Symmetry: D2
Subunit: 493 residues, 4 copies
């Protein structure tokens, strides 16, 4: 509910390396475009391989035995994370406003959702810093055996544009809690907010080199991180397509540890006994949240025969009702899509939907004639074999599906190489308990959707990812287990 | 459906101490009665304080730093518990016959349920023996910190008669897996099967004095254990009143650790939307299982008012057809109560129910003319103020209660000093999820009853207990935690 | 290093109940005496049983199903704890000054040690609030099984006078992190600091009733808590003597869960290969810390033959060197003892030491003639059979012991009903590894002493206590495990 | 000292698929050679991609939702793994004889070490099967949240020849305990013992297609598994170079999860204050154990300069007396290398060491004239730049290095792309504690070597691996975590 800053000052537009604001070696820059107007907000440094090298070198120095970062109490890593949270909260209006400027998401979402979870993810992992225990192990023989939960080391972190601050949090927070150093490559489309955050990292007191931020393109900077021979781990969030190239690059370089957080085509499933009104609203936001550009979006809405006409009819009405407009307006629900390419990609899929024989129920075209706005779009009578049913559209397009039986809707929902998330809406206990086992997805929701918090481990089955972020389970990926085994004069229980 | 052994060889009738069969210092015996016939089976050693002191010395010595049992690999404690389970399997028919002889439960229970769980509990904890890890802890300062999950030491174990072999296993399996030594005091009513198990403990290869079994009366042998200045821990399963005393003896003697597993007045709650046929059957067996002598018996049946009369009629029907008879007949559903005293107590409670204004619906008197059999009894119209509603009857009496609202039946189910168990029957997701929170009991079942296995932590809220047994959580009471904190020259993460 | 407030305003001197400052029902008060001058600082409310009843009633209302405290996110319990930390830090000079006024400990200790650990313990458990997970359990049959880690409920907490704020932290922080409500009875000798803290609890935003503070006497208020029929748990820190009465009272009342943190006579053990200078200094502070009034104080210093004369000689010199005086002076190392009784108790033990044939090497008498100061006192040639060797003196008296062999010093160190802590000083690996297994104490230190932090579980073997505080292990005592078990239509791995 | 079986019956020479013995689709075989004699033993089926596809279909079907293996109690997966261990015990002499026949290791190794660990690993993981718990998570909002520790699914398992039975067990035991299905590709050099184990898997009672064993070449059969679009996970133990490829095949195919257990150049480090006799013996056996063909072989021996010459002379002495000969002679300490190719490779490295300027001290050529035997070889004067210092020789060659300072030898021990293991020999507490932190390897030993058991997480830093095997930590790679988040009507703590 506070009011935003409509023309924020953007002091930070350079590379953040070893706590110093820095131009690319090449001195090159590249523009970021405000998607609500189509106009150039400003220019940021265009980092390439040579800048990744400087960043990796600094993060390596910060990770070396006896560095300040390695020697500080685990609890001091906690306090630093906690202070960062406090700084984010202090500058919450600014940060959420900058997010809306650069990303285009509504300011209500940006302030009340994104920034809130950013603050929480930093606070949450602040708490884990000194509670991530190893084991003492009653092994055979005259031994004292235990494990250390050491950091894995220099982590390369690559994130997308859909939730810039949140995706940065998800990566930085657990990596820092566990004592790693970071070289992070943020999306080309949304470089600004992450840079203001790096100023807060400096203000918070993190040693130089522990966090380094690189703005630039994916195939240049990013491939440089994935391919780098002195990066111990890459944590990648992005398209399934690019995921394939990251795991390859790891095998091609130095066998760096890999976590992948990838695409999805997540099914919401409404049984006939569900609270209709609630299921229609949840499935509606399941897809339309963040202008359809959420990775775990409910992008296939499956609906039982007995209730499909009513469900369809109310869903259409909700799409038509959703406020589209300037995201700085408090009641805007859908901002523009992120850029020209994403915008045309989505209109292309709308066109494709119709060519394939899917029934267009509303929208289906540009909204207005400035920026990259698209009318909320719903498709009826979609079938499993259609391109719009199999591929990640990543936009405000809701395809509806009809089903009769439980066995059928399980098979159809799981018949995909994706497996990021899934949801069921039902009043019945046994049905809900069965769906939680049957659906092949990293997160299964019951009578809700998109409830991903700092506490909840999150990741794909199959080609939606490899490994888990958030919660206690999110720490494993940032941990290199060492087993210490010591000969003792006598063992006793 | 295997065949029982009737009137079999019973060599073990003495105290098991430091792996040698011994009578009490005073040379006394006491009789044990077959509840089916009413006839004395044999006499058994009558342990008192001087015998307990003997057993405590044996336990203390087997637990001394450097002993075989302390120095042994944790995995070998595993292999021993597993050998024990193999031996119980080999002699399964003999033990199931012996329990039925001495306690009175049907051979179909004794063989298929009791003995199966006994094997499973030695087997389950055999596996925990070498997996119960301490922690490495990234504390402040220039320190390596870790914890050892050491055994507490000499553990006094006092069990009841209702599941003589199961209760012995619930005690011995976790205690030995964590490497303690045991002085066990078996119930006076059911001494025989626990002594035969002791012969297998010896055959398995447990060092002398690790397990020490004592037969005797509670006020002498039990109280010597609870009051002993060299018992490190008491684990007690029995009556709430005796539990009060056990806790007082620990405070009056040596501040030994105390786990208490006490009585219940556990409610089964049947909502309007439940599967009627299933709910009737489940709540019938919740009470009458093991002749109403189960600690977690569903000894109050609360039923929603719209389905009350239907549930009532079906419940009386099912009580009228329960097969009462000789427990060696493979199809007897109900054996005799365990001794004269228990039999008369339950008859007293039937009478009491009638004088309080509760409607007797069936049974309500002795069955037959030899042994200690009671007809399955059901009461209707029961109120919360009645003594049969408040007190643990511990026999074949099923009181039925009527409720209208959710909020009313939670208050009434929880309005008791007890909290061992509870159960709900419903098809509704939301209602099930609310009751699992709202009911104050250590185990809440949904659409089932009495499902307590080696994996499931079991114990009481309020005066139904202190601590938990079974599962990983059952290991905590048998652990003394030692923190070890060592100056190191330089700490790195 | 900041300067203290020498005459702090003491606005809070009443009972804290349901967020309201409150006189005892009786309107009675009792004085607290400044131990450095012998003069009455002021009067606080004298709570008795009737005031405990009002406190318990309020904490019960705050714990009821659907209360604000029970419904708030676990993470909001974290934030509240974290804000409390922030408030303690804000008012750190005041609080540490008030502690020195009422307790008499040096302001350097009070500020740099006590207050620091108070801030950390609140911050540490703030982090645990939303990370204390239960289990999902792959049990036998067609079941979904999991455990809830519910709060145990209304916790009675009774603490001593030696570290008023710290002992309050150790109790409040984990109890609140896990969602319990509290009725706390603080020591009669040191009521003031805990009351200022309760104002911070209110300022932080904790719901009314969640924390209640009672000032008053042990046998009146305190026994009332231990004996209370609606208190679910008592956590007691105090004398072993009173511990016995708490566990009794629990058995005598409602079987409330009991944790006991009791006395000690902890041995430090210096082997011949230890860094002499360092061992002399560590063993010196091991006892003399907090004027000898630390519970885990190294109150028996065992020293190897080859090095005893040198060790003795340097230890004596350190005792004589230790600055005694006004605790508000920055370089004071030893303040006065807490009150007249403790003061004479210690001088009594000094007298007793000499009567028993122990060799007085320095001090042995009052220091000056105002307040309750005692000269640092060391005894040579102490033997295991002397009263000064067996009993908790709780003052600035260091007895030295000589030993030859490792087996011997193990037996002598463990030959006591106490077992709170222990320490060894040695350069040798195998020796250190052996001592960590052999010594029967809840904390074993290697080449240091008194390193107890929020991370490190802490408690007695034998009659030094029952259960553990601090670290992850500190949460178990404040947890009531509930096992939920649900019948499902089909189980799959 | 039990007696081996020479030239025994070997019925199993084909593929094990869906519990039926089958040849390859192409009907081809390949030979296996006895490294002792040099003579062909028998021929074995040559699996290729079409055979793998067959095996993947069998694994996929046994893993389908609702199958016997999915629906089975976790505890029964336990009991099956345990039956398997009983059967391996029954046929222990036959298997130990068969491993010695096919691989060449001494029967004293094969019987007493290898087979013992195999039994222990099936036994250890049998116990984990029903104890691998997920979590209940007190997340934000009106939600019950929990995790399921589901199996990842079809697991491709590729093992080497150096410990044919041990490596098979390290793979199958954890994977089956967590309820996966397996397609295993056994080494071409050592196919026989793994097929006999398959006969016991069938006798134990594992459902069809749960375990599927394939004999064949790496580039065909191995690569079909790593590249298959329906294998969910690859676990690979072998060479670093092949590990690179495995990681690339996963990225190029279906983003299957990858665990890699790769090569080493693990250093043993002997400080001046170490037990000389013990250190010589330990570092000698660290290298020559299993004929120098142990992944974690102590293949660099760094020795403090003050004790260098003494250590050198004693080490050559111990190399000169190692009993080289027929591995059925019970007292042979060293069998032959495994095949022609390995034999020539190691001879090449001996020669290479001489041309680089390293002093040959003993052996350094073929032993005898039949089979593939090499004399124990030691080099002195070795430098870090030499190829024998950098490359994994994987045979009976012990390079000796000289160091002065602590800081120097950590840098040099860590200066490698490898990090499987390391070890220190010292009596000093502080020095041991520093090395356990400072060395970059997944296992650090202190005053021992090669102590890897079922309890101890094992794996590489850097290019020695990704992830860990053995212990509780080894279960994580075989787990797909599912978060389940359910709307509830009211949340209470
Ligand atoms: N293990 C630990 O964590 C730890 C820490 C600090 C102090 N201590 C111990 O505390 C003791 C010193 O403090 P203390 O003298 O105040 O001990 P204490 O036993 O006299 O009193 C402790 C607290 O309990 C109260 N109390 C006294 N009698 C009571 C009764 N009958 N019922 C209920 N409460 C009663 C007191 O008022 C006080 O608040 C020493 O033995 C010391 O070793 C232990
Ligand atoms: C608030 O402090 C305590 C409360 C109870 C028990 C022990 C301590 C304690 C004593 N100590 C001390 C105090 C003084 C010394 C010391 C030793 C040698 C020379 C000077 C001071 C060491 C530890 C600590 N702590 C706790 C926090 C960790 C840091 N240190
Ligand atoms: Na932009
Ligand atoms: Na005072």
């Amino acid at each position: 509910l506070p009011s935003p800053i409509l023309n924020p000052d953007i002091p930070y537009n350079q590379l953040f390396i070893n706590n110093e604001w820095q131009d690319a070696v090449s001195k090159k820059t590249f523009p970021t475009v405000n998607p609500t107007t189509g106009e150039v907000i400003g220019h940021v440094a265009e980092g390439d391989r040579a800048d990744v090298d400087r960043a990796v070198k600094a993060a390596r120095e910060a990770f070396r035995l006896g560095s300040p970062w390695r020697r500080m109490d685990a609890s001091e890593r906690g306090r630093l994370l906690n202070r960062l949270a406090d700084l984010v909260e202090r500058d919450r209006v600014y940060l959420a406003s900058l997010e809306t400027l650069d990303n285009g998401k509504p300011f209500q979402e940006s302030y009340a959702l994104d920034l809130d979870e950013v603050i929480k993810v930093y606070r949450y992992f602040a708490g884990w810093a000194d509670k991530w225990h190893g084991k003492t192990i009653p092994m055979d023989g005259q031994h004292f055996c235990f494990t250390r939960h050491e950091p894995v080391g220099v982590c390369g972190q690559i994130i997308p544009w859909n939730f810039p601050l949140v995706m940065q949090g998800w990566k930085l927070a657990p990596a820092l809690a566990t004592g790693n150093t970071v070289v992070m490559k943020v999306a080309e489309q949304t470089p600004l907010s992450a840079l203001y955050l790096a100023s807060l990292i400096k203000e918070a007191g993190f040693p130089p080199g522990v966090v380094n931020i690189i703005t630039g393109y994916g195939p240049t900077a990013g491939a440089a991180i994935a391919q780098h021979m002195d990066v111990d781990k890459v944590a990648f969030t992005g398209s399934t397509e690019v995921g394939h190239l990251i795991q390859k690059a790891a095998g091609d370089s130095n066998l760096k540890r890999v976590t992948l957080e990838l695409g999805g085509k997540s099914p919401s499933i409404v049984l006939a006994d569900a609270d209709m009104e609630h299921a229609v609203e949840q499935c509606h936001e399941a897809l339309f949240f963040n202008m359809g550009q959420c990775c775990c979006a409910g992008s296939r809405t499956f609906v039982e025969e007995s209730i499909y006409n009513e469900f369809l009819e109310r869903t259409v009405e909700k799409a038509k009702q959703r406020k589209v407009g300037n995201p700085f307006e408090l009641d805007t629900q859908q901002g523009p899509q992120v850029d020209k390419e994403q915008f045309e990609r989505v209109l292309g899929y709308i066109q494709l939907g119709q060519k394939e024989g899917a029934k267009l129920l509303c929208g289906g075209e540009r909204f207005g004639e400035r920026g990259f706005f698209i009318k909320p779009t719903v498709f009826g009578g979609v079938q499993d074999d259609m391109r719009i049913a199999k591929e990640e559209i990543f936009g405000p397009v809701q395809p509806l599906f009809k089903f009769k039986k439980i066995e059928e809707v399980v098979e159809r929902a799981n018949n995909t190489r994706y497996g990021l998330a899934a949801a069921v809406f039902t009043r019945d206990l046994d049905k809900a308990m069965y769906f939680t086992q049957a659906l092949q997805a990293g997160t299964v929701w019951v009578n809700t959707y998109n409830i991903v918090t700092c506490h909840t481990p999150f990741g794909g089955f199959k080609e939606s990812g490899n490994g888990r972020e958030l919660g206690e389970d999110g720490l494993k990926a940032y941990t290199e287990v060492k087993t210490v085994t010591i000969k003792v004069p006598q063992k006793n229980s």
